Amino acid sequence: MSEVVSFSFTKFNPNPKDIILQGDALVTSKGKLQLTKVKDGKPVDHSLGRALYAAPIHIWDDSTDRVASFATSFSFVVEAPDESKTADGIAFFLAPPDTQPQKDGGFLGLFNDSIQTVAVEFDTFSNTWDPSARHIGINVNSIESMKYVKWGWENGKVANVYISYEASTKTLTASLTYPSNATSYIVSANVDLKSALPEWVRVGFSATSGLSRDHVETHDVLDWSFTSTLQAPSDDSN
Template sequence: MSQLPILFAFLLLAFIPCSTSLTSTFNFSSFTKAQNVTYSGDAFVNSEGNLDLTSTAINKNSTSSAGWAVYDNTIILYDAGAGFSADFQSNFSFEIFPLGANCKGDGLAFFMAPENWTHNAENNGYGLGIFNKSSVANNSQMIAVEFDTYANYFDPSGNHMGIDIGSFNSSTTVNWEPSMENSLNATALIQYNSITGNLSTHLMDRDRSLQWSTSLDVNLRTVLPGKVVMGFSASTGLCSEGHRVKSWSFSVTVPDRTPSPAPNWHPAPNWQPSLT
């Protein structure tokens, strides 16, 4: 039997447009060591199924602590050759809490970075474990949403949420409620719309009585490579606090960019255009 009909069939299928969206999603209602997440530094899963990113033990040094939790599978944000860009949504509940120290810091972050990214924390807590002060070039292809609890000289306050684009100096920030200065128990929602280029982040306290949000327009193709890794990081410097992620869900979807068909308009019988 000739192979030409089979070859022709495969070629024909290759040119049939796909009508379904490319979607990837997961939902971790709690954390286990068996999930597709790699923990490093001081990060660990506690007995309650929560992810602690920095040391929380009273008998262990909780200053100069850093930890990371990185999802094992790479995420495809865009493919220039195939001509698509993806939307994504990351939703997680977390807690930042005091450890009885005289001061608190530094915070935690959700981040995306190139596939070959490796962590390199600095002992003073700078950069929340992802941005490096001594090698600024390594920061350029990264984005993060930070929940910062320590006021550096470039920060608006010691309690703020910010969007970082290739730099630890946030492009946009919003302060959260002063009454939550010592402890933050909240849910965060991060969304990116690849059509409008809008990256937004929303924060809501546990009682759903207080909400904060900020956003900016950014073309992630100009910042990130097409394939990225993502996860959480946190660090402490001379001060200390606990950084705990309780649950995490994520989805990435390629939106349908097929243009709407033109209206199927037909003139009425005997219709004539007006000449006046």
């Protein structure tokens, strides 16, 4: 009646055997997780890459009415040669363990037109279902976010992300901070993990570059820490 898992990497090892790389994703010799293709130092169009931690995570348990609380921190960089033409974005996500890459472009490698996936997206291009401004969105089994906050993307600057899920209140909270100019953004939503996802999931990142040559950008993850605890609800708190 307690299961706890954590991991933390201050950079990635170039051939990381505890990370499942999908699509174009790779780790560079200097330990950056380059989700979308970069060639000759330029980001390339029509790229999709994802990365998952090797172990599935026990996020809820039907036989005991436990639901996990979790938290994750990571830093990422999106750098674009043209700040007026950026696409498509990067996300943190949870999905069934055998999850594969879904539709490219605006679907971020996570969703499709035709899917259980919960995601926090950092969305750089306004699709038909998006607000006009770049945004941080919380997504539950749809590319259309259930709640978002407008996001002032800073080209090429390190973004520090912290995401937490409080099982007792069903509250998912996502924040981004730029240390370069000490500016931050936050959004929360009420999210029921038990109805959106299966009992076991893999967790990780997904990103796509645009579907035209002139809307390109990198989606690089520099470090990552994750913890989840599946335990019985407390009867005495408040």
